[model samples]
Structures are given as C-alpha cells and as structure tokens.
Target chain A: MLILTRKVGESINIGDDITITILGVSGQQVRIGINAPKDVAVHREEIYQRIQAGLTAPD
Target chain B: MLILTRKVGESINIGDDITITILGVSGQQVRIGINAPKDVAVHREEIYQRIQAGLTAPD
Candidate 1:
C-alpha cells in the first residue's frame, strides 16, 4: 500500500487527470472532493453496489 | 434493482428515514440528492475503491 497522510486542504493526484482533496473531518466522518474527467463514472459505494447488483439480478 | 422511473424533483424512500431525490439531469449525467443518517458513510465509487484497495494492497 502506498500509505500517505494528508491534512485537510491537501490533495493527491492520480496520473495526470484526477485529483482528490481532503476537505474536512468531523468525528469519524471525512469529506473529500474529487476532480476527474466528466466521462468517468463516480458514485457512492452503496449506490454503486446496488447498481451492480441490479445489473446481475434476474429480470 | 427496484426499478422505478422518476422525473426531476421526485424522490424515493428507503425504509423509514433515507430518501433519495432526483435533482437534475444533463444529457446522460444526473444530479441526485440523498438524505440519510449521519452514521452512514457516503462515498464515490472510485474513491471508495481506491480506499478499499489501499486497505488490501500488499506492503
């Protein structure tokens, strides 16, 4: 694992296009911002999982 | 997936508290609003996958 620590307002870049920034931390919850190409699909994990499961479910 | 078609401003309830609303749609992109308990974690799929991969990656 490439373990790195980033404080709030700091960011990490992926290749050349994507950037993830730490926005805030409240108790156990952390908020982050991501910048990526518009065509790249982004979704909440639970929602994504549900969507994936939906794809595999019987009609 | 519990398939349902909803226009912008329409919402769906999950269980008792969580509600997901369709805010807008631009071309193939959609804007959605979610209301859930603070204890629940919400994350984008790409970010969530990256975090999960970080957890399982070999040192």
Candidate 2:
C-alpha cells in the first residue's frame, strides 16, 4: 500500500480524477474530503471490505 | 483512504482475500507484500493511477 501525509487544509490530487483533502486528523480516523465523479463508486469501508475481503473467503 | 501501521514482520488481513505484510520501511517508502486471488487485481501504482485517475478526466 502507498502512504503519504498531508496537514489539515492540504490536498492531494490523485492523478486528476479524485482529489482528497485532509479536513481533519483526530487520532486514527481522518475527516476526509473526496471529489469523484458520480460514475465512480467510492464504496464505504463496510461495503468495500464486504465485497473484496469477505467475498474472498466464501469462495 | 485507510491508513494503518504495521511492524516489519506484522501483517494486516484485508477481510481474507488479501494479506498485506510490512516487508520494510526505509524512509518514505515501505516495501509491500500483497496476496490476492488470480481473478482479483492487485494493481500496481502506475496502472491504478492511470486507469482510475486518468480515466476520471478524459471521461
């Protein structure tokens, strides 16, 4: 996995599609700002984990 | 993005399909180990950035 850090108010442009801004970093969880087109599916943790990780096992 | 830390020998089990191991951390970059099924994609940075990030724009 890739890792990088940004202070609150700083932002990282993922290529050109998604722009993630560091709204807040209180402890382990971060308040995030994401800019993605409506077509892209930004699955929340639960769904992403369920689809990718959970699905990996039942098969 | 989800961020977590692991020791050089410790690992994180993503659901069950993918297992990420912290191989090494020398300065900013961390050596990575990812295990995914043959059908699943463990996309390299370049391809991922290009496909999602790039496609976000021209689309």
Candidate 3:
C-alpha cells in the first residue's frame, strides 16, 4: 500500500471523483472528511464490511 | 460518512476498480489490503496529502 502523511486541513485526491481531507487529530484519533460524487458510496471501513456481508447496520 | 463493520478476511469494493480487504486486526489496529488498478494511485492518507501539497515524502 502507498503510505503518506498529511497535516490537518490538507487533502488528497483519488482518481477524479474522491478527495480525502484531514480535518483534525485528537490523541490517537485522526478525523477525516471525504468528498465524492453522490453516485459513490463511502463507508467506515468496518461498516462497509459488515453491510456487504449481509449483516444489518446500526441506525 | 458511511460506517460499517467488517470481520477478518472479508472485503469491500469501491467503484469498478478498487477493492478493500480486511486482512486482520490486533489491538486497535485493523490491517487492510487494497487492490486497485495500477492507473489508480493509492497512497496512505497523510502521505497523499503531503505529496499533493508539493511537500517531500519520506522514503
């Protein structure tokens, strides 16, 4: 995997449709924001796995 | 943001070319594997931001 380091408020683009921004970091937490077209689906890593596996997701 | 839960060895797909696989987990670390076309660049979040901002990346 390609690894990178971005400071808060910086952004990285993926292909032509997705942009990932580093919003903030709290302790060990790194908060991020993602921008993508409505046709694209964005999910937390874990949630995406569960939902795709046919498990019900939290409301 | 979309939130989901995935187990070890499961996988998730993005668009037509990207696939994110949950390889394993330990402590709070979730090890993942990503498969994408070579034309689709994949970089670690921070590094991507820094590289795109014209900053040098670590080797």
Candidate 4:
C-alpha cells in the first residue's frame, strides 16, 4: 500500500545503530539519509526488496 | 563480514552522489552522517531484509 508516507524532516530509528533522517523536500521530491555502522548495508528499500526477491536493479 | 571501524573524518562516495562521513567516535559509538540526493530510499540492510521477507518481529 503506497498509502500516505509522511513528509520530510521526520524519521524513524531502526535497531540501536541505524538512524534514518529525512532531510527535506524540494519540489515534488523528498530526500533522506541513513546513519549506521559500516558493515550495515544501506540501499534503497525497493533495491533491498529486489535483492531479497533475487532480482537486480533496472537500468 | 566484520571489519574494523575507522577513526573520525573518513569518508566514501557512492554512485557519484551519496557521501558517507564519519563524524568521529565517542566511547563505543562511531558517529557518522550521510548526504544523498532526493528520491533515494536508504535503509539498514538487516531491517530491510526482515521486512521484505515478511518475517517481522523483534529488533
């Protein structure tokens, strides 16, 4: 469900290491960043989903 | 794969856009930050995988 995701500058922390920060919005786009340990892989959620589903990023 | 944490001020660039910055360490914590363009969905790998696998539970 795409539903209604929250706006920018709002965030949710995951576990005790990763901190996701919503920077802000520019026009119709939203920007975010993650602060986490190096060993922790960070990727676009869909990318992770695709990886879990045994797929690759599209060109 | 485990790796040693580097001291502060170290950095790495990803995809010609995202930049990871280590903001120094304090005690057992290694503070860091990231800069990325809008429309990028960033997440910690383990958490991302759990959700994608539909095995949501615990931290």
Every candidate's DockQ is: 0.03, 0.09, 0.17, 0.04
lDDT of 1 at A56: 27
User: For every model in order, what is the iRMS?
Assistant: 14.8, 8.3, 6.1, 13.2
> Sorted by lDDT, highest first, which candidate order results?
3, 2, 1, 4
Give the CA lDDT, 0 to 100, for residue A9 in model 3. 61
Better of 2 and 3 by DockQ: 3
Candidate 1 segments exceeding 4 Å error: A54-59, B1-59
How high is each candidate's TM-score? 0.42, 0.41, 0.53, 0.35
**Which one wins by TM-score: 3 or 4?**
3
Model 1 pairs in collision: A43-B45
Candidate 4: true interface contacts recovered: 0.00
What DockQ does predicted model 2 obtain? 0.09
Q: What is the C-alpha lDDT profile of model 1 across A1-59, one tens digit per residue?
A: 12234454555444333445555444333444556565343344445456456462324
**lDDT of candidate 1 over B3-43, digit per residue (tens):** 33445555543433344555544443444455656533334
Q: Taking the tens digit of each residue's C-alpha lDDT, what string does model 4 give over B1-59? A: 11222334544333334545545444333344656655354444433565557654434
Worst 10 residues of 4 chain B by lDDT: B1-10
Instruction: Give the interface RMSD of candidate 3.
Output: 6.1
Candidate closer to the true structure by TM-score (higher is better), 2 or 3: 3
The candidates, ranked best first by TM-score, are 3, 1, 2, 4
Rank order (by DockQ, best first): 3, 2, 4, 1
* CAPRI class assigned to model 1: incorrect
Write candidate 3's Cα lDDT for A4-33 as tens digits. Answer: 444656555566566655555444434556
Candidate achieving higher DockQ, 1 or 3: 3
Candidate 1 structure lDDT: 0.45
Cα RMSD (Å) per model? 14.2, 8.6, 8.1, 14.2
